[PDB]
Design a protein around this ligand. Structure first.
Ligand code: 1DS
Ligand code: CLR
Ligand code: CLR
Ligand code: NAG
Ligand code: NAG
Ligand code: MG
Ligand code: MG
Lengths: 32, 291, 291, 48, 97
């Protein structure tokens, strides 16, 4: 049915991006 | 403290007259530019949407169950004796049913007699304007039983024992799927499993359940379900003046001068419900006929 | 005074103490002073610009009786959620030029929040920022068949908690919670878009005079903040049940890039003005816009 | 801090006026005052 | 800040009743418009920023009892110092031979 979205997928997708994003600025700010 | 009106430098509101003009020009040009961008961006967005089908329909996946008399709080309270008390309620019924008379469906060209019994859902092509302006299935007020607005009670409607119908939210492309024969909760007030989507109403509250003993359902062909044949809806632009199927209920023995609650539940495979939306395929009402 | 070589009474009276007794601190002292003074101008501006898009929906919400484009909850996530981290980062910015070379400000002639700042943020950057937000707002609605032209005056029937037969221009019927779930879902990108534009406003407000590349993006705090801000926003929409606790629902991917151009346009506009300030020390660019 | 305070009290006062007039009004303006005031308290604690 | 806010709130308060809105709600807007206009997060931003700058002063043994005093040194136009102790080392010391 065209009235269903695999929200959980992009939901998890977003989670992943944000989690990854945090570690990146973290790496940057803790530059050594 | 507020003497910026004038100065030796001829500042108006603390500002020079010529420069005012210069600022005015900048703002005007700039603001026009932004709007010109904004509108142009919007024009794009217009062209990213089809004119026949919406791009996203996931939100309306659970259908809804509206009522004809839209009470400020789903509550009906009035005097049977007093016309004025129920006059306002009556008016709402009048407007909705106005576009349903046999006379209203004057043009045979745009009206198809679907039939006098439920029949196969009528798929009407792919949703494109390659075909023409598609056809609508009719619906006579006579189909409503003993709750006909313009017939037995043309202006009276119900002075006591009021009628109340439910309606399915008009939805593009919904293919209803009637429930299978074997459902444990299913109470078979009718045996029409093949071509009807049943709606049954119960008090929900035990106190209310006792309060109303019986209710009378009226359906096309004496069947208490939406006709599968009428659907699917093809869109307002594609199908102007499309008529939603109507199902009516008239309550029988009732408790007067008391408040009771009735829960109307649609059933079928393709129907969901939510404990946060009291109207998402479910239905509640508070009703009190005080004399 | 000098901590180890000074009278105790004088030290208490003094507003500043030197432990090492290195008189050189004064030099660093004024250096920081004139430096922090500027960076505050920068910092204050970033938050201020945000208010124009913050407030704007509320205004039109009354003017044209449309569904509310932005929730108060999200605003808090901007003023006090995302925006803060970049705002702190601004202070770390190094001096554009050697400040020690310039004269003391005059407390009458030069002020912290000048008239220019307002016109720059409230008048221009914020207004562009707001336009990006509305674009996204109109886009989402249309993409679910709620056409911009058709959204006028719709507020009244919209916010009613009982009218569940609202008609979209496509022609479908919607229940209260659904169309609310949409209004909430619509609110979330407005917030998101706000971060997208606040990207540009952050960069441009990193420098007053020199170009962006000229200053260089060596400020680690600023960089970490952008990622932190972005991550927070993203998480804010995709954590389990945010639409339950804070009434903020997930986002369909194409939404994220809704206003990337709007912000880019912002970045382009400020940079070209910075160049215009550079090329010519003429007053019109300076007096009107050099906050 | 004082200026923010005036807004908060103003938010708090606003909710009362709102509650009396409408029916079941949204707790938005109220929520605003609490956070606004809290900000000052937190700010004050840090400053002290 | 407030000066523009009142103007906006008042102007809206006018255009509110210009449209079919009652005094009862028109005030609610004027309050709300002025309210949401008020900056909120800025207070803690500025304060945190100020303390941070002082830290580096304290890193180099430059301390200030009053936090809001760091900016004053940069914003000065005239100075006056005491020759003894402040400028001198206040020690009789071998000068020239
Ligand atoms: C978009 C951002 C563009 C901004 C930019 O060019 O930034 C200046 C940058 O480059 C320095 O500035 C010099 C000034 O001439 C350049 O000649 C560079 O060769 C280099 O010495 O400094 C940052 C830290 O690495 C930033 O990431 C970028 O690398
Ligand atoms: C470096 C920056 C400025 C470039 C622009 C940021 C882009 C790459 C980031 C910022 C936020 C991100 C989005 C956050 C959430 C999701 C949900 C995920 O399931 C699909 C991708 C999507 C939609 C991401 C796409 C990439 C994205 C848009
Ligand atoms: C320099 C600037 C001003 C050029 C302007 C280009 C604009 C008008 C173009 C470039 C990229 C385009 C966007 C690309 C992505 C999407 C997602 C889509 O689902 C809605 C349209 C939208 C949002 C487009 C709108 C039109 C757009 C914004
Ligand atoms: C109907 O409403 O009216 C009839 C009188 O004309 C009556 O005999 C019949 O029982 C009624 N039926 C219902 C279902 O109300
Ligand atoms: C069309 C119809 O009535 N079909 C029913 C079927 O649903 C039911 O399961 C069966 C009982 O065994 O009896 C049949 O008559
Ligand atoms: Mg704000
Ligand atoms: Mg001395």
């Amino acid at each position: 049915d065209p009235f269903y979205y695999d929200y959980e997928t992009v939901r998890n997708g977003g989670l992943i991006f944000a989690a990854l994003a945090f570690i990146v600025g973290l790496i940057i700010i803790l530059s050594k | 403290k507020k003497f910026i009106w004038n100065s030796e430098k001829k500042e108006f509101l603390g500002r020079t007259g010529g420069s005012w003009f210069k600022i005015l020009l900048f703002y005007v040009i700039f603001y026009g530019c932004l709007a010109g961008i904004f509108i142009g961006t919007i024009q794009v967005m217009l062209l990213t949407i089809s004119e026949f089908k919406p791009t996203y329909q996931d939100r309306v996946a659970p259908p809804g169950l509206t009522q004809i008399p839209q009470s400020q709080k789903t509550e009906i309270s009035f005097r049977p004796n007093d016309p004025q008390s129920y006059e306002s309620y009556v008016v709402s019924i009048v407007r909705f049913l106005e576009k349903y008379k046999d006379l209203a469906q004057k043009d045979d060209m745009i009206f198809e007699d679907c039939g006098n019994v439920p029949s196969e859902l009528k798929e009407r092509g792919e949703y494109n304007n390659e075909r023409g302006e598609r056809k609508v299935c009719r619906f006579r007020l006579e189909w409503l039983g003993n709750c006909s607005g313009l017939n037995d009670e043309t202006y009276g409607y119900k002075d006591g024992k009021p009628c109340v119908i439910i309606k399915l939210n008009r939805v593009l492309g919904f293919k209803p799927k009637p429930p299978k024969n074997e459902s444990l909760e299913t109470y078979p007030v009718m045996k029409y499993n093949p071509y009807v989507l049943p709606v049954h109403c119960t008090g929900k509250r035990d106190e209310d359940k006792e309060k109303v003993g019986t209710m009378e359902y009226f359906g096309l062909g004496g069947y208490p379900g939406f006709p599968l044949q009428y659907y699917p809806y093809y869109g307002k632009l594609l199908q102007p003046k499309y008529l939603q199927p109507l199902m009516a209920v008239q309550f029988t023995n009732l408790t007067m001068d008391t408040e009771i609650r009735i829960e109307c539940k649609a059933y079928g495979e393709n129907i969901g419900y939510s404990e946060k939306d009291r109207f998402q395929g479910r239905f509640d009402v508070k009703i009190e006929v005080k004399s | 005074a000098m901590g180890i070589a000074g009278s105790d009474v004088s030290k208490q009276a003094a507003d500043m103490i030197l432990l090492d007794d290195n008189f050189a601190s004064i030099v660093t002292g004024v250096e920081e002073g004139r430096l922090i003074f500027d960076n505050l101008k920068k910092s204050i501006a970033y938050t201020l610009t945000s208010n124009i898009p913050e407030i704007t929906p509320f205004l039109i919400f009354i003017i044209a009786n449309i569904p509310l484009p932005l929730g108060t909850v999200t605003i808090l996530c901007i003023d006090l959620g995302t925006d803060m981290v970049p705002a702190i980062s601004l202070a770390y910015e190094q001096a554009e030029s050697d400040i020690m070379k310039r004269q003391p400000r005059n407390p009458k002639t030069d002020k912290l929040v000048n008239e220019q700042l307002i016109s720059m943020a409230y008048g221009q950057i914020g207004m562009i920022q707001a336009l990006g937000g509305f674009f996204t707002y109109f886009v989402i609605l249309a993409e679910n068949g709620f056409l911009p032209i058709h959204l006028l005056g719709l507020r009244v029937n919209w916010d009613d908690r009982w009218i569940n037969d609202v008609e979209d221009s496509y022609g479908q019927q919607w229940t209260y919670e659904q169309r609310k779930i949409v209004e909430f879902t619509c609110h979330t990108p407005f917030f998101v878009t706000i971060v997208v534009v606040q990207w540009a406003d952050l960069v441009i407000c990193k420098t007053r005079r020199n170009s962006v590349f000229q200053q260089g993006m060596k400020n680690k705090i600023l960089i970490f903040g952008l990622f932190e801000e972005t991550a927070l926003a993203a998480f804010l929409s995709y954590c389990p049940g945010m639409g339950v606790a804070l009434r903020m629902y997930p986002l369909k991917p194409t939404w994220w890039f809704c206003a990337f151009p709007y912000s880019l346009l912002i970045f382009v506009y400020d940079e070209v003005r910075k160049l215009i300030i550079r090329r010519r020390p003429g007053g019109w660019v300076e007096k009107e816009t050099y906050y | 801090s004082m200026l923010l305070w005036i807004g908060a009290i103003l938010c708090f006062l606003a909710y009362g006026i709102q509650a009396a007039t409408e029916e079941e009004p949204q707790n938005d303006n109220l929520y605003l005052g609490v956070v606004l005031s809290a900000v000052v308290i937190i700010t004050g604690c840090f400053s002290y | 800040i407030t000066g523009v806010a009142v103007f906006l709130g008042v102007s809206f308060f006018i255009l509110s009743l210009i449209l079919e809105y009652t005094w009862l709600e028109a005030v609610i807007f004027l309050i709300g418009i002025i309210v949401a206009n008020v900056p909120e997060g800025l207070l803690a931003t500025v304060t945190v920023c100020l303390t941070l700058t002082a830290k580096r002063m304290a890193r180099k043994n430059c301390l200030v009892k009053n936090l809001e005093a760091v900016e004053t040194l940069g914003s000065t136009s005239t100075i006056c110092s005491d020759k003894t102790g402040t400028l001198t080392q206040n020690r009789m010391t071998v000068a020239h031979m």
